Amino acid sequence: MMISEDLRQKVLADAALGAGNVIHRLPLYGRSLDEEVLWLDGTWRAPDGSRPEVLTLGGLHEVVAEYAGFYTRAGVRAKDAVAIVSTSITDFALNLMALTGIGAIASLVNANMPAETRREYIRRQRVVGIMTREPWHADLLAHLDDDEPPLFVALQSEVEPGNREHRPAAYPFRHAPGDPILISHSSGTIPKSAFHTHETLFHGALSRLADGLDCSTRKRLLALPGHHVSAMSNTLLGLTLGAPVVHYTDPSGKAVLDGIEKHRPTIVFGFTHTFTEMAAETDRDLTSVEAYYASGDRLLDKGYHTATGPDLKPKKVPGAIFIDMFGSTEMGYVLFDFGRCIGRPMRFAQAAVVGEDGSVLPPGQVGRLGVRSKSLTPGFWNDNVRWHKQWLGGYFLTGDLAYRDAANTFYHLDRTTDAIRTEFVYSAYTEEVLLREYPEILDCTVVFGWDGVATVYALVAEAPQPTAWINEALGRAGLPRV
Amino acid sequence: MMISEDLRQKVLADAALGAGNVIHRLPLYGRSLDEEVLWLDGTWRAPDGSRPEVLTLGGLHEVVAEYAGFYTRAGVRAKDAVAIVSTSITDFALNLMALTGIGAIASLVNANMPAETRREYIRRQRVVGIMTREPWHADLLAHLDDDEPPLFVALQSEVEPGNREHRPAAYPFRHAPGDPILISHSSGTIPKSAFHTHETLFHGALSRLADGLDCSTRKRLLALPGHHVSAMSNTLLGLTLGAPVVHYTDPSGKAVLDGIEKHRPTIVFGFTHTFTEMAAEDLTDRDLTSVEAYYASAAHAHIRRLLDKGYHTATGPDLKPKKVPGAIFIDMFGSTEMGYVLFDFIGRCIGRPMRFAQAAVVGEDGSVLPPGQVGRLGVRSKSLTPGFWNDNVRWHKQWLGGYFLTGDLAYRDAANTFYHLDRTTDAIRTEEGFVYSAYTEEVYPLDCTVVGLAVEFGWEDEGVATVYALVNLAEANEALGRAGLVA
Amino acid sequence: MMISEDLRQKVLADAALGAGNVIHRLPLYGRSLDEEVLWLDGTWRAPDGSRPEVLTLGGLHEVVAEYAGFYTRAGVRAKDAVAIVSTSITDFALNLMALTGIGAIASLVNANMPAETRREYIRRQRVVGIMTREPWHADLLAHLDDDEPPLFVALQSEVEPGNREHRPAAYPFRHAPGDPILISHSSGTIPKSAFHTHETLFHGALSRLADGLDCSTRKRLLALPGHHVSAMSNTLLGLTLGAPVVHYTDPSGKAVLDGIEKHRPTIVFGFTHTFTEMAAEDLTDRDLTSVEAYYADAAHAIRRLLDKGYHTATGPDLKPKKVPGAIFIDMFGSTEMGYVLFDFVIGRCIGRPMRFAQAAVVGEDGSVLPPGQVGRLGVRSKSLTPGFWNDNVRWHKQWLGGYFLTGDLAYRDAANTFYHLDRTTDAIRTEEGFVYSAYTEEVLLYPECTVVGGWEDEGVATVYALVNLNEALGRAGLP
Amino acid sequence: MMISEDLRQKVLADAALGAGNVIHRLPLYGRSLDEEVLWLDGTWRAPDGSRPEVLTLGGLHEVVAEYAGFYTRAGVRAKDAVAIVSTSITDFALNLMALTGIGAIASLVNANMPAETRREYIRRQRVVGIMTREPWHADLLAHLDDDEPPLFVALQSEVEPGNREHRPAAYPFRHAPGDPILISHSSTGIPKSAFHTHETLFHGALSRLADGLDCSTRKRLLALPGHHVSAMSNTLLGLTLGAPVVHYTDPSGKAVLDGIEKHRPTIVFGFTHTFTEMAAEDTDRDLTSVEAYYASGDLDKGYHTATGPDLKPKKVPGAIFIDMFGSTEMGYVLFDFVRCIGRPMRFAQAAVVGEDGSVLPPGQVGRLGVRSKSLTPGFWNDNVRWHKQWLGGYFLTGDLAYRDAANTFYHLDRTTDAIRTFVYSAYTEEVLLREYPELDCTVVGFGWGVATVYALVAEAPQDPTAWINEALGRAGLPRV
Ligand SMILES: Nc1ncnc2c1ncn2[C@@H]1O[C@H](COP(=O)(O)OP(=O)(O)OP(=O)(O)O)[C@@H](O)[C@H]1O
Ligand SMILES: Nc1ncnc2c1ncn2[C@@H]1O[C@H](COP(=O)(O)OP(=O)(O)OP(=O)(O)O)[C@@H](O)[C@H]1O
Ligand SMILES: Nc1ncnc2c1ncn2[C@@H]1O[C@H](COP(=O)(O)OP(=O)(O)OP(=O)(O)O)[C@@H](O)[C@H]1O
Ligand SMILES: [Mg+2]
Ligand SMILES: [Mg+2]
Ligand SMILES: [Mg+2]
Ligand SMILES: [Mg+2]
Ligand SMILES: [Mg+2]
Ligand SMILES: [Mg+2]
């Protein structure tokens, strides 16, 4: 369902509400502190020592209050950065609600980040403290010998019942629109660190709630990367809408086929890989799901979805929705909803297929995807050098090459770094045609860029004799050939 | 083709630019005065006595100067309203350009307005002046017996070579964003008076251009009704773009077929009534291939006959341009209150809200409705009218829940795509639910009218009725059955 | 004393709050219904037949509920304008709360508007209803012969205990920022009808409060004309701040000197004439020590009243220091202004523009003039009226250069301090220069007046002084 | 004089105008490239080897196009930062006008910054190249051994006639509102490096022009610190209004008295000190040209126009003294008064903030805080000290103050300088320099733990402590 007129107006009239104070406002809207709101997978160990399967609004306020005082006692003050090295969406979200209540910044770090690289990334942030769990803690104590070290490398088990008494007197913190609440990192291709504020992280959400969109009470299962800006924006968003949120730390398509069947969620958030794993695996009940929300680089037919019939009345079409979202850590929210089509920019965002001089390119020509929005990061942490340089012509270059039609429908063709000059070859597009001409094809990778010419070569039941096989798909379709 | 970056940046850097100074600014961008800007129907008598078929930047700037001065000598001062009573896109355009230079307001009035209604409509505006032509001038002198009478009921022929000497010394005016430039009117259903400002009438154009949209140089044939804000909006806009504009006073399908063949426009603005007329013609060896887009502005429209005689550029799998058969059809959603289109694309799909616009399906209390639920179409946009000339009573009554009600009932898919069902007034209640006459009508491939009859049965009116289908056509409710959905 | 951080943050975090729902928000901030909020002066008769001397938040919400219902039963609907014809800040203030609750607009009309003009002023608003009292009701029935006649001409006595049941179910209305709440009218010089919205009428108040200004809890005595927009905003604003508001229907110097003694207010709002009169009394056995600020108006004015007071200052110890005499703020306003745009020698200093306002001295082509040059005062603000009701003709004609001409001529110093000289219409051209009547009157006022004899008309003239009781002109430097 | 209606409208209708395109737009408004626009003190060497005494618009555009190509050839690309290490307002301004058109950031560094610290400041910034002059260059070549080194530590003589050909084809650069143009630095610890953009650096200026303020054609003499945000805004501002700008690199009260006598300027910009030293000089000096002195940081021989009772102008004696409150991070001045700081200017919002950040009531003492789109968007490469400088939604300026009911602020002290007993040092100091005409005072002492205050300042006293203390007693303050 969609939220009531009552909650919408309460939300849109709360000039204070933002990513940094979401749970402390929910009581004031009238929610009961006994209601169940956030459903856990079992990985998360509570301070009393338990492993809760569900938290209520009040329980989450005391879990968050517990971690909060532990930090304020360990010495965390406002505007202080805390590096959080875990892999549990539940881990990051609770530390962010706590650290935000004390006015601090929860710098989320995926523990699996390549080790020698994680050290430079955390080192560069100058955080006053690290918090982690037992699997990575022994290595993170190296950071205590950093020129400017963290005050502490702690474990979550160090947060014990009653630590909340040390929480500050003016709790919770009163955020200003611009007060940082988070720092996230890029995924691969020295990760770039972007910080997010009380306002930018919820700018897209509320902008959508205001148009009458993305404002359902439907149960959502969040099996996203736990460190990623969206896992936090959707755990924060669902709680705000009153939508039962469910955290799954298992990215396996098979664990999410259990989760879909166990929790029977109406919508399911994950990355493309997760939905793929799900797609390869008849006797599964995916009846509850009406929409899959994906993001990053055929389970649909086992579902259903509501539409408007010619009677101008609801219909229960068969199959669920697959929504390919285009996002980044630095993009804050999603800026588009739908070659490979990304869709039209949403009303609180501006988009351009930019040129090398930065001039908006006309429709149909290929260029750098560029965007603008107050949902966007205000900058790279401690690194003004790289940031101002990732902008061209007034747009934030997202790092992808694309083109657009007259409606401003955009299509991702390739990564800028991945396009090849060959007397040009956008590989993600080139890859996709092959998986579409030759169904048998499970995977493809097409290999002088945006510098000089080169040559391109494929990487894909039976086999061919090779080039001649693939090169027939390209010829029919009209593309340069390997 | 798209305008150059050099021009785009100049427009987007011209904080001064708006609906009220378009022609006074193009020179400053580098436009040559010798250059041609405007192609005419041959129906306009110029001050020289001529009926020129094309005006240059410099000559329009000349002809505008004359009307401008003629007005300044008749006593028109800044912020004054002047009714233009005509039936010619071209007349409305030249008086509008002129009044704006002296700081004045051109109240467009369709002369074909019923007389006593048109008399009521102008009387309410309290204008200092009417300018019309001989077809209506004799009747318009009645307004000289209004309690607050216009200073003059003039004729266009009265504007003579050399009248420009009387225009003011600071010509051209220096408009404020909020300065009225124009007043438009609705179509019965007394019309409402929407006033548009130097900002509202250009907020939508410039916003889109900023995104790299609706900003091509292609030759446009504007056979729109001259008195609509849409006719003036696109006229001015093309001038701004460097796009060849072509005014046609004859909206007939045969007339426009000639213009398409004569001028070979890339895009054509007209009303559904015009595009339908064209589609009922041989069109065997009519060359309508120049056109890639037909732009409409309730007539619902065989149009596919016309589209198929065209082409449209697309991006193929070679990732390079590709000529494709058939031209585009854009049914834009428009009203007086909207100085641009707000929507871009089961039901007449109106489109998706445009970045500078906000749209909602609203309940009777003004509560945003969920998708699939049927309500009143509502909007918000800095392109909208700031209000009805001399009528805050009617203006405010049109706002519900914070949205401006367009008078049309609708629903929107979960993608925020809006689909028109009916005008709020035309819908019939039955003991089995609501019947939307516009949806039934367009729902057995001449005319239809799903009227109904019985009592009060309207969106607001509680009380049921029964529906009846009135079919034109000839060898005379089972099609209703063929798709969901009369006695 | 300043409002608490807890209230400030609640107000500043309340995206919904505006002139049209001030009381409906106060509870949600935590105010008690039992608390007293509005102190009246015995002129107003309540629905149950009383003449209460104070109202509580809960009881004001009850009185407003009744008027609202009575109107909702008479047929008044949302975006429907209703003329309120009275002379009482309390009448207007109460009808204004009720109409907003149903989403309607209240057109404040001062009954003492000359009849033949007052009829034209109401006719030009096409209201669905008039509400008034016995003094004027029989005459106001002429509007029943208007071509578009009000649905009803009612008396306030018709509002009976229990009419509140008829109010709408969704009471109270939910205002949009742009939703009209109020119409005010100009003195005359037909008056212009300026309409104010849920947003504009509080746009200034809220701007000021964000800054930590114009936000004290001090008790305030409003002896302003009830029909002026500022009389309603200052009422509305005081309730918002939690400050005891006190309505006085009598603007006479005696009545207000009595009120100051009875209620011992910290600040007093009135028109200049009110304050001049108080200054002419004995002021010997009077007690005006409570007052630290007089808030005032083409009438000039009174150091007697000020010396009977005090004002807190910062001493060289960096600590509070009560000092003799109370403050006088000679504020500049019009119907169109909404809030005050200027925060207060050669001329009547107008003050400095406030953060949410822009002011300019413009020429006849609308150009910005330099400091020291004389021109027409012009302004811009989100507090200003968005237009004249049913008069776009008159409205657009008051703008020059992007600015709203306030109808006055002025100059400003290099500090963008503006000084009023005269109303554009009162200035006299002469073979030797321009003469500003308000400045000249002021200068002359030898402590023992009217300078007469145009700004747009190129004709020269001669000027003459009329006293009631040219060497003084020379002394000060004038012609 | 005020600028014309024509320039005002032209400027206010240039949505492209900002700090990074100031001279490239001035031709478009209709200025002649033959006009003289910028007056120099003689200490500047031109590419040809000349030391010009005045530059024209086109001459500025050629000298600017020169450095641009030398920089564009040396390998500087857009959004790239260049540390400029000098002491000359002319040095910094010419390099900033140039880099801006190449799209690069002119990171202004005062060469006299303590040495080992100016090393750590430049090394943190990670610049692509250094530019300096012979007096300091030999030391700046050390930065070539830093972990992430500069492409070039170059000298200004390396920019030679004809380098302008190497400028890019798309020149000048098209700035976006948020594109960086400058990095300036503070003056109580490792200086903070604040970056400024094409919109923030010029936001106050144009906001004032819009209200009809700070828009004169009057000749102005800029003897400000060459590296300071001020010295750049008034230069760009002077060029924009059409006012003859004049650079004096000598901050001595005597050198400006020579400058005010030689150039007869209408207004004079400097820091508090230059005007003070100037006060101890002379009588037989002609400062009649001057009607206003503009100061920042930390008279009877002139005239000023006022409005007389005839409502006609009146040349009064003595020039105006305007004590402005600004900082590198504040971008523009946010307060004006003619220690009263004045009222915030319309484009600025200010508060005396508590320790919880709550707007304090009038009369109580707190941290000075402000908000404006003129403010810097952050400290270069340092999002850690940046957010920590904000409290309650405000940017703490570093000063303690209080305000009256009009929002007139009075600076009392720097926050670091107030001693608990509480005694605001700058206020106490001035109190004593007013009871006793004397030289200069400095009150020391537990800051914002208790302490005891002591003093530091023609006859001499026996009990200097008995003395000073009667001033305080009468005045009403804690005693030393
Ligand atoms: N694309 C469209 N699809 C459906 N209806 C449309 C479309 N464009 C316009 N309309 C119709 O045209 C109307 C706009 O007409 P206009 O504003 O000129 O006057 P009116 O609405 O007929 O008269 P009145 O304003 O008195 O009600 C819309 O309200 C709608 O009914
Ligand atoms: N502080 C003040 N000093 C001097 N005059 C003031 C001051 N405040 C208000 N006024 C005068 O009061 C006027 C306010 O206008 P108001 O709306 O009350 O009616 P009006 O202007 O007299 O009527 P009309 O608009 O019909 O001429 C100002 O234009 C100005 O002349
Ligand atoms: N008008 C003024 N009155 C009093 N003090 C002022 C005034 N203007 C500036 N100051 C003082 O000088 C400072 C101006 O900033 P500046 O650019 O000199 O760097 P800074 O503040 O000295 O930096 P840091 O203290 O971090 O080294 C203000 O912070 C304030 O302490
Ligand atoms: Mg990736
Ligand atoms: Mg990237
Ligand atoms: Mg309509
Ligand atoms: Mg009392
Ligand atoms: Mg007035
Ligand atoms: Mg400092």
Side-chain angles (χ1 to χ4, degrees), chain C residues 140-467:
Chain C
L140 285 159
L141 294 170
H143 293 108
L144 273 184
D145 267 19
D146 286 328
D147 309 62
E148 274 209 277
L151 250 52
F152 66 90
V153 170
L155 281 176
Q156 266 173 232
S157 66
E158 297 180 26
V159 177
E160 315 200 284
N163 281 355
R164 65 204 221 193
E165 69 219 328
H166 302 279
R167 101 198 159 274
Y171 191 96
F173 188 79
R174 207 217 101 231
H175 287 266
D179 280 356
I181 53 144
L182 175 124
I183 308 177
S184 53
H185 85 249
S186 84
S187 318
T189 258
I190 310 87
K192 319 196 237 147
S193 40
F195 84 93
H196 300 284
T197 63
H198 178 74
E199 159 144 62
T200 90
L201 185 42
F202 248 42
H203 167 86
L206 296 154
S207 195
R208 279 300 263 203
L209 181 154
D211 288 357
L213 324 169
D214 291 8
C215 61
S216 99
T217 59
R218 298 165 332 192
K219 163 186 329 187
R220 55 212 58 204
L221 195 92
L222 308 208
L224 289 160
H227 71 93
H228 290 166
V229 78
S230 76
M232 302 287 95
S233 49
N234 278 116
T235 291
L236 290 166
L237 177 51
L239 295 151
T240 308
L241 289 169
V245 178
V246 182
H247 278 186
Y248 260 73
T249 53
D250 207 345
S252 70
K254 195 269 187 166
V256 184
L257 275 166
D258 278 64
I260 299 172
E261 272 177 354
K262 166 178 217 155
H263 303 267
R264 279 199 30 115
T266 314
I267 79 201
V268 166
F269 290 89
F271 258 42
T272 285
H273 44 96
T274 297
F275 296 138
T276 273
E277 293 199 5
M278 334 197 294
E281 300 296 299
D282 74 30
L283 294 114
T284 283
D285 313 302
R286 279 298 199 183
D287 199 348
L288 328 174
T289 54
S290 54
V291 189
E292 55 211 50
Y294 289 90
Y295 282 112
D297 265 329
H300 311 101
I302 72 97
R303 198 164 160 288
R304 321 229 307 143
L305 268 163
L306 268 55
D307 293 349
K308 287 210 133 242
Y310 304 93
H311 84 69
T312 313
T314 318
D317 48 331
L318 296 193
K319 276 175 147 174
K321 161 217 232 96
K322 200 46 142 155
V323 318
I327 306 309
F328 200 66
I329 307 84
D330 190 16
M331 297 165 153
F332 179 71
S334 59
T335 51
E336 309 85 18
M337 310 265 110
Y339 208 76
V340 163
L341 312 173
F342 291 104
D343 203 22
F344 186 27
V345 296
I346 288 147
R348 178 187 196 160
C349 184
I350 298 152
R352 201 177 90 130
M354 261 180 250
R355 171 165 82 59
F356 54 91
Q358 285 199 256
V361 159
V362 317
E364 308 310 281
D365 66 353
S367 285
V368 156
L369 294 178
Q373 278 189 26
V374 171
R376 300 146 170 278
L377 196 45
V379 295
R380 286 128 58 150
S381 200
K382 257 158 281 282
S383 74
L384 295 170
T385 177
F388 295 159
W389 190 265
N390 288 335
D391 215 343
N392 280 140
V393 175
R394 272 218 279 203
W395 174 240
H396 308 296
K397 204 168 37 72
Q398 324 264 318
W399 291 71
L400 188 53
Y403 289 95
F404 175 78
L405 301 192
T406 73
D408 297 281
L409 286 167
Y411 88 85
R412 62 158 176 134
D413 74 17
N416 230 20
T417 299
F418 293 71
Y419 304 88
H420 179 281
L421 301 178
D422 205 19
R423 289 194 107 270
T424 320
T425 79
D426 291 346
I428 327 175
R429 171 185 328 285
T430 79
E431 267 273 1
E432 305 95 66
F434 264 109
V435 167
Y436 306 109
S437 73
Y439 176 45
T440 322
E441 271 154 47
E442 273 180 277
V443 168
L444 290 164
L445 210 183
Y446 308 153
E448 54 255 38
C449 183
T450 279
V451 187
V452 317
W455 190 251
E456 320 198 86
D457 297 342
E458 275 164 52
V460 283
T462 47
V463 129
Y464 290 50
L466 327 182
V467 185

Side-chain angles (χ1 to χ4, degrees), chain A residues 5 9 12-16 25 174, chain C residues 5 9 12-16 25 174:
Chain A
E5 181 78 9
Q9 297 298 137
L12 291 178
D14 195 349
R25 319 289 308 166
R174 219 210 66 259
Chain C
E5 182 67 15
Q9 296 287 288
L12 296 169
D14 182 5
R25 312 307 291 188
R174 207 217 101 231

